[PDB]
């Protein structure tokens, strides 16, 4: 939610 | 155990950033359900809400802990996110706000 993770 | 002042302005600086346009993601405890994944990488999480809390309750004992909880706000961030984001450009002008808030109040 709004996250852009940098694992997956 | 930290005086009346020093809950004063720690609760305002909360508040400035609680105001923040950048504090979006940071308002609230990031839903562990729904970011499958999240706690697997981050081993304490925070936010805004919780330290509020923990504020009012009395559990900072003094100003550094407090300063620390909110760093791992914004570190919390930085390791989940891409920086080149929203959310990852987000944390990083909460930072820089909280940390020139922190040193010109004390
Ligand atoms: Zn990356
Ligand atoms: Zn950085």
């Known amino acids: 939610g709004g996250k852009a993770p940098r694992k997956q | 155990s930290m005086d009346s002042?020093?809950?004063?302005l720690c609760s305002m600086?909360?508040?400035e950033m609680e105001t923040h346009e950048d504090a979006w993601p940071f308002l609230?405890?990031?839903?562990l359900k729904l970011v499958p994944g999240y706690k697997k990488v981050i081993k304490k999480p925070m936010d805004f809400s919780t330290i509020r809390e923990k504020?009012?309750?009395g559990q900072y004992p003094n100003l550094e802990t407090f300063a620390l909880?909110?760093?791992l706000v914004f570190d919390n961030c930085?390791?989940?996110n891409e920086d080149d984001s929203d959310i990852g450009r987000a944390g990083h002008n909460m930072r820089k706000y909280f940390e020139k808030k922190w040193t010109d109040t004390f």
């Not at chain 2, 002042?5 to 004063?8: F, G, I, N, Q």
């Not at chain 2, 609230?28 to 839903?31: E, G, S």
Request: net charge negative.
């Open chain 2, 5 to 8: 002042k020093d809950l004063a």
């Open chain 2, 78 to 80: 930085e390791t989940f």
């Open chain 2, 69 to 71: 909880d909110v760093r």
């Open chain 2, 55 to 57: 504020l009012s309750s």
């Open chain 2, 13 to 15: 600086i909360l508040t």
């Open chain 2, 28 to 31: 609230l405890p990031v839903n």
